[PDB]
Amino acid sequence: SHYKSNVRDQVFNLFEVFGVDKVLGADKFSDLDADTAREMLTEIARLAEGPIAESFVEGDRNPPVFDPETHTVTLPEGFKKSMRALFDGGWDKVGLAEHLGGIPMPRALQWALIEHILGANPAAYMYAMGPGMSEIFYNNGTDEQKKWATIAAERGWGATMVLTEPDAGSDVGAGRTKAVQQPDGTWHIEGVKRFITSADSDDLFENIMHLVLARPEGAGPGTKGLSLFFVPKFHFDHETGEIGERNGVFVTNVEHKMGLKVSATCELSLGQHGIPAVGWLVGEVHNGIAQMFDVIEQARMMVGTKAIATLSTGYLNALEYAKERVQGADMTQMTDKTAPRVTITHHPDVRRSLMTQKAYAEGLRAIYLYTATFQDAEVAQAVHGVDGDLAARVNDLLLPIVKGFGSETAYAKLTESLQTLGGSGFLQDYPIEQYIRDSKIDSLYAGTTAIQAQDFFFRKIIRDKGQALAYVAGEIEQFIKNNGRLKTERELLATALADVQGMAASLTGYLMAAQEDAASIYKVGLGSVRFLMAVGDLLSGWLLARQAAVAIEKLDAGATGADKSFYEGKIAAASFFAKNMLPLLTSTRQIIENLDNDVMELDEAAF
Amino acid sequence: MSHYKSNVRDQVFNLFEVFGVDKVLGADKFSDLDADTAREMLTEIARLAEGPIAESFVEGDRNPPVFDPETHTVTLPEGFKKSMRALFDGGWDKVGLAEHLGGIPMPRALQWALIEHILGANPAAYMYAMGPGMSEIFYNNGTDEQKKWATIAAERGWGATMVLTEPDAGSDVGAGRTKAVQQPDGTWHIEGVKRFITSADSDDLFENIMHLVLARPEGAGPGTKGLSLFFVPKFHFDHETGEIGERNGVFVTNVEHKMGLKVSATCELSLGQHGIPAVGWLVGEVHNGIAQMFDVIEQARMMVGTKAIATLSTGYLNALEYAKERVQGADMTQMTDKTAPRVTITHHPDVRRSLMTQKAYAEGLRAIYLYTATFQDAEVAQAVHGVDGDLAARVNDLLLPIVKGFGSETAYAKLTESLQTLGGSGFLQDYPIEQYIRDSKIDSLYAGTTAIQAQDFFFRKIIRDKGQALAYVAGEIEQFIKNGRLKTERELLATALADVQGMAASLTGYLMAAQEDAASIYKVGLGSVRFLMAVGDLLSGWLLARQAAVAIEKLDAGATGADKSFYEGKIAAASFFAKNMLPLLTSTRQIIENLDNDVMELDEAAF
Ligand SMILES: CCCCCCCCCC(=O)SCCNC(=O)CCNC(=O)[C@H](O)C(C)(C)COP(=O)(O)OP(=O)(O)OC[C@H]1O[C@@H](n2cnc3c(N)ncnc32)[C@H](O)[C@@H]1OP(=O)(O)O
Ligand SMILES: CCCCCCCCCC(=O)SCCNC(=O)CCNC(=O)[C@H](O)C(C)(C)COP(=O)(O)OP(=O)(O)OC[C@H]1O[C@@H](n2cnc3c(N)ncnc32)[C@H](O)[C@@H]1OP(=O)(O)O
Ligand SMILES: Cc1cc2nc3c(=O)[nH]c(=O)nc-3n(C[C@H](O)[C@H](O)[C@H](O)COP(=O)(O)OP(=O)(O)OC[C@H]3O[C@@H](n4cnc5c(N)ncnc54)[C@H](O)[C@@H]3O)c2cc1C
Ligand SMILES: Cc1cc2nc3c(=O)[nH]c(=O)nc-3n(C[C@H](O)[C@H](O)[C@H](O)COP(=O)(O)OP(=O)(O)OC[C@H]3O[C@@H](n4cnc5c(N)ncnc54)[C@H](O)[C@@H]3O)c2cc1C
């Protein structure tokens, strides 16, 4: 029962802050009303806290075992039981297209539902991403492939995304797996891929769809030469879906990892065992990296939401421990060594720790839900007044924040959650040490933090001509310019916004200088991650302050009891974050304004 | 080779070229230990560490100790016991031991440099080997008769434990309820249950274990001042010959399952609860337990900080070796050319940023603990600093919570950069960095949590000290600032010194104003950890700048080859640290100047 959920904060964001209930019961969501959405959140949170979280510890302590002669993994029984509870409730089809058996819903609600599985047992959601992948295959496929995608979604096949090779991780375009065209128009895929999540999954599914990047013989270099292929674990009857003979794609190793142990992470060999790995060209066009980024975009959203979900349950575990742990006297009585003992929430450093965890957990929740409000044209129109084109560019801008800032922040603040338990935090008896191990990977897969920061600056700001960035900046500025009980917070946000504008100007300056001195581009690289984290902090502080403004209205109107306590904590979090996290951005701007290439010119031997 | 990458070159640079410890080698207490022999010892223990000690690092984690309830003992993996024997066979469990107990006299600065290698290679091995050093502390606090037993204990290499913590008494040692009942013969029966005792059993490593136990004599007053310290051996023994006799009533009942440091058996320890009394002898036959035990705690806190620093160092050097060989991506100056040559990742700005961050903190932290150690011998402090015994003791006590608190927190945080440098492979148990992270998380918790370190630093080592040690250190920093190639660094150090001065003044004001407004003291608690970390950053930057000043002199004198590369790295690290780490202290000062009690007044239910 490690998993502590926060449906109340989810509903607060979705309805009281962002107004996603504006679209419920109209247009694409005509059959889903606000009551039902709330019931779904409560239901999956209960299921997550129970049967899904039930095997969280077991998956880590009794991890999958690989049989190299069968090329299969065995998963622990309790975890597979958790997977069946997910399937029996339909929770592998959250947000699936209606024509694939899904329940239409705004993406903001879909990711809030998914947060609970990611908090309780995140590898369970990863194993369950098959139907979502089938929908992406459907969207990119020919008419005939759409029929296969429909079967795969209805039968609940598992799925993988297969990019990485030993020499091609961040540099996808270096991959050497090849595709050999056959006279009948299929392809034979030949190569060894590495680190493939869920490439075998015991007997969870009757089939697995591998979506594989490979280079057709004679194609050009880099990512632009790659094509994407549908490579099923088993051949099947294209009309009925009846499972046929084994296709030539075999797991040949399973990694031993720091955490996320129950997610089998696999070396995957294609066409290496005397049986061809037949692949079908997705959409029967050569457009592999663009097609695969439909998948990567979802994976990056998931990984960021995963890290955020994990910090939230980490914080709530730390809080519940702190409420009960008696240790020491109140600081106002520290010299009286017979003073009454107090619970540790009375100690200033513990309250600082807990409010740091709270503000970042809740600010991050607001960030991913805000990001999701731009993932549906109809939601972005109704709740922001933004047309479909700008909505897509804003969503693309925020994804590296969700992924990069989410992963880095959650892992770092889980350090505070563990510390709150004292020595017991180091014990496996409590879940926080597993939270830390399970979440360290989030800064690495789906593109490292450095790759996120490079995407954010070069593709999502510069190539975008800053239009999404300017949009978000204008919303922040509008909040600042708009009661005076938030006057101090709006002043701190104004400074933080000017700091981030300054960082953006400096980095853009170094880029322009690279027209004359190519090495000036290195300064962009040196500051890129700090810039990404700075924008994340600014967004956290702004969204928390928006939450405080709503909380003030609800308190003024007469909130009582648990509602009152909730709203009071929003005011406290927004004020704490503005006063203790935002000012650091000023020093970070000054640091970025003074970057130089000394560290780039230093001989490698001097390190 | 092994996981453990050592840096004797940087240790010798600190000891000789920076701090001048070789000036006392060959004179007075160290008359028969010259500089050549000191260097030989460091090189020899580094090889022992890289060889047989590191050999069981992985095995201790993957095949951890097992509790046997049939015998109330713990069994250790055979490979780790072989590492322990390599330690004993070379006499390294006697490092810095008093000559009359069989030790080789040496400066504490050299002793801790030797110990760093064991802590980097397999830190639990040093912990199990702390027996003879504990016997020396028993000797110094013991009666004339007890001094005879401590001598036997050191000569026989008995293990030892420090036994304070109980389920309800961790940070608040004074709440302990373990009891001592005096017997007619002048011995005591100890009755109670202790928790989290390191090395509480150790298989067949030793013929006896000395437990140093805190307990409250019947009728004594409350808190730590009512505690007494007892010598409680695992076996009774002949006080003249040392021959092992009957089992004493002190038994392990459990072994904790921990995130890391797994091969260090951490045990619940039951005294007098299994049918026979736990006989204890009052140490020094005086009631003075917490003062006596703090002789041990001081050593443990130095060890823990040095452990964290040793672990970051080998983490860094592993990441650096990996980065030098990993090919991935094109040079940033060619990023739009998709056929540009592939480069090793040390060519990427974010990777060089990461590596230089790891390097500067690892080397800055090594300078800090070695600088601290130069104040632990009156003769060294006199010779290398010109400070008398009293001031030297106060400066050492000032710096200990920096070594422990700033060392532990910084090492764990920067190991995140080390792991990130490996990409997805950093998440694999195939590489040692994930174990470095798990093994080092505990360094912020045991031997006093970070909050307790920061409270000790401010309340006891500054305020109670009337700032004398703090003013001495600040004056040394100011003298360096006062004094061309280091002008920018000295300017940044001047800002950082003023920032820490401002922090100290704000927190002192919050404390003194508590006389008229009791809740003012909470702002001290809110700011104390950030202040401890700021002092650590300031010291890191100053010591790095001192190292660069030495490196400039040696480069000007004509250094070549590997020496020149080393010195160039010192100049680069001092400059990077001054420009990228120190400025953040300005924002932290302003944050501390604006702390308020809103987070203290908030209802606990609002969290
Ligand atoms: C179903 C089971 C899932 C279980 C959960 C598993 C979770 C973790 C799984 C993984 O880790 S999957 C492997 C993840 N690998 C990555 O994320 C790659 C990281 N490297 C990069 O992102 C590089 O920055 C890369 C894009 C590879 C650089 O290659 P490039 O060739 O230099 O890229 P370029 O900038 O020129 O763009 C080429 C085309 O790629 C598309 N594209 C790039 N970036 C994006 C983004 N951010 N969004 C959408 N598409 C993108 C474009 O088509 C682009 O072409 P264009 O510039 O428009 O002409
Ligand atoms: C042998 C093989 C094992 C080694 C490997 C194991 C590694 C780690 C093992 C452990 O974790 S052992 C358990 C560690 N426990 C602690 O470190 C306690 C953490 N809590 C504190 O430090 C509290 O701050 C404490 C001091 C307990 C508060 O109690 P207090 O009663 O309120 O303390 P007070 O400030 O009034 O002083 C009382 C007496 O204690 C001595 N003393 C306190 N601080 C120090 C320091 N920093 N140095 C030296 N002595 C200290 C004084 O005797 C003081 O009395 P006085 O004020 O001088 O009259
Ligand atoms: C691996 C391991 C080995 C150990 N080995 C030994 C050993 O050999 N011998 C031994 O005696 N002990 C040992 N311990 C005990 C260890 O020193 C304690 O865990 C530590 O002192 C913290 O105490 P606690 O666990 O009770 O946490 P708590 O004291 O309950 O701390 C809980 C939280 O409250 C905070 N807090 C507590 N009091 C205050 C205060 N007054 N002001 C502000 N914040 C406060 C703490 O910082 C922490 O965040 C070991 C522990 C571990 C994990
Ligand atoms: C648990 C796990 C599961 C995975 N699952 C999958 C999966 O299902 N499918 C899949 O396709 N892949 C998967 N991967 C692969 C994963 O996405 C890669 O590990 C990741 O992209 C990093 O690549 P790499 O490990 O080769 O590291 P590298 O690319 O070698 O990176 C090493 C270091 O260099 C830095 N670096 C590299 N290039 C640059 C650059 N141009 N600029 C700046 N810095 C740079 C990186 O930031 C990093 O710090 C998985 C990995 C893990 C660990």
Break chain A into its structural domains and give their ranges.
7-133, 141-147+158-286, 450-607
Q: From the CB of B423, is ligand 4 less than 6 Å away?
A: yes
CB contact under 8 A, B441 and A436: yes
Residue minimizing CA distance to atom 10 of ligand 1: A446
- The residue in chain B having the minimum alpha-carbon distance to the alpha carbon of residue A175 is B328
What is the experimental resolution, given in Å to one decimal place?
1.9
Give me the residue from B350, B590, B604 closest to A450, CB to CB: B350
Q: How far apart are CA B138 and CA B156, in angstroms?
A: 15
Q: How far apart are CA B545 and CA B578, in angstroms?
A: 8
CB contact under 8 A, B454 and A349: yes
Tokens encoding A293: 């980024």
Q: Give chain A's largest Cα–Cα span.
A: 89
Cα distances (Å, whole numbers) of residue B133 to B141, B205, B291, B296, B306: 13, 17, 17, 9, 16
Q: How far apart are CA B183 and CA B174, in angstroms?
A: 24
Domain B141-287 class, CATH top level: mainly beta
Q: Residue A213 in 3-state DSSP?
A: strand
CB contact under 8 A, A332 and B519: yes
Q: Residue B305 in 3-state DSSP?
A: helix
- The answer to whether B531 touches B503, Cβ cutoff 8 Å, is yes
Q: How far apart are CA B15 and CA B43, in angstroms?
A: 14
Q: How many contacts (CB atoms, under 8 Å) link A and B?
A: 266
Q: Which residues contact B117 (CB under 8 A, 6 or more apart)?
A: B4, B6, B42, B45, B46, B48, B49, B50, B53, B310
* Number of Cβ within a 10 Å radius of residue B503: 23
At A334, the amino acid letter reads M
CATH code of the domain made up of A7-133: 1.10.540.10
Contacts 24+ apart (CB under 8 A), B517-521: B518/A332, B519/A332, B519/B597, B519/B600, B521/A331, B521/A332, B521/A334
CB contact under 8 A, B259 and A337: no
Ligand 2 atom nearest the C-alpha of B297 is 17
Q: Nearest to residue A48, comparing CAs of A82, A98, A11, A13?
A: A82
Q: Nearest C-alpha of chain B: how many angstroms from A427? A: 4
- The answer to whether A266 touches A254, Cβ cutoff 8 Å, is yes
DSSP assigned state of B100: G
Domain A141-147+158-286 class, CATH top level: mainly beta
Domain B8-134 has CATH 3.40.50.2300: no
DSSP codes of every residue in A378-414: HHHHHHH---HHHHHHHHHHHHHIIIIIHHHHHHHHH
Cα distances (Å, whole numbers) of residue B51 to B2, B42, B303, B517: 7, 14, 21, 59
Q: How far apart are CA A544 and CA A570, in angstroms?
A: 7
Q: Nearest C-alpha of chain A: how many angstroms from B548? A: 13
Q: From the CB of B123, is ligand 3 less than 6 Å away?
A: no
Buried b (16+ CB within 10 A) or exposed e, A486-517: beebbebbbbbbebbebbbebbeebbeebeee
Examine domains A7-133 and A141-147+158-286 and report if their fold is the same: no
Q: From the CB of A139, is ligand 1 less than 6 Å away?
A: no
Q: Taking the CA atoms of chain B, what radius of gyration do you get in angstroms?
A: 25
Q: Nearest to residue B434, comparing CAs of B600, B311, B529, B572?
A: B311
* Number of Cβ within a 10 Å radius of residue B217: 18
Q: How far apart are CA A237 and CA A235, in angstroms?
A: 7
DSSP assigned state of B428: B
